[PDB]
Amino acid sequence: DDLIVWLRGDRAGLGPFSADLVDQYWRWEQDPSVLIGYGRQTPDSLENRREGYGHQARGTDDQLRFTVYDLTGQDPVPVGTTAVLIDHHVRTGEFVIQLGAGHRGRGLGTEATRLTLDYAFHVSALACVHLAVLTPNTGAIAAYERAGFRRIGERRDSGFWLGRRVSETLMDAVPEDFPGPSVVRGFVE
Template sequence: MWLSTGGCALGPYRADLVETYWRWEQDPAVLVGYGRQSPESLEARTEGMAHQLQGENIRFTIYDTAVERPVPVGVATLLPDHGVRTAEFVIMLAPEARGRGLGTTASRLTLDYAFHITNLRMVWLKVLAPNLPAVRAYENAGFRPAGTLRQAGYWLGKVCDEVLMDAVAEDYTGPSVVTAGL
């Protein structure tokens, strides 16, 4: 594990977990949350994994560490734009991990990494407006509403707005696991 706190940890993105990641991505709640209408084959996902492991994006496996042996429960990704030191944030949790605060904690750990290791100045995300549990989790992690993309997404087959949220380094108020050991 690279960063850990409060029953949650971030560790390496792993090729041996491709089928697990794929299973989570095919969960109807994830498809709805991403606004996707169609699932992806395991073969296509496996091909994409090789590309992801070689890319410049920063990917973490999220672990539940409140159990006897850490269990993978999700993925957090930073899609950086190194030219302006910003990144888009994307997170996905397994169905069994939702509603327990792991998304909020993993988001905080990812922001900690982004601001204290990668030296990003801003991290942003898009979330479908009707996904109120996700909006609350992001706010609890330190993201703030930054605007709305009107009619930019789909939620349960209906057009909806997407909310833009951001976090900037100087406003990051979460306790830092990174700097605590320095």
């Protein structure tokens, strides 16, 4: 009962960024695959994440932070995190996502991204959500395309993939391109 779920899809759900899961967040974020995908170069320390959680909690006015839940089992189980950094001046947000090691390839990222778009469009009233993703990270590309993002173009020589200088793909999503039924509309009506 402690694990609150706000948005419930068919396969995934979103809930708040609970403080009981800060060590799990640290372990997910310091996985080498996530470091490669994000492009972070150094692991962070657990003490520093524990300290940073308080500042993350205080600064919530222009930031969405969710814990994604796998709803295929009897009870929800957290599988990753999603975040949108909101710029209230232009109604846009920047989207990032990562899942745990054992939860990838099962589709949870696609519906997690779709639910994040639903929340950002229909609760936050954002006009555009955009992301930057390293070009070789093709799985994320496909997940974002099916979630509702569209390709803008490639920013040449702007990241490292396994030490090699590679481009990164810029993608964006707009409310009129949002696929599938919206859970938030079900909440309101």
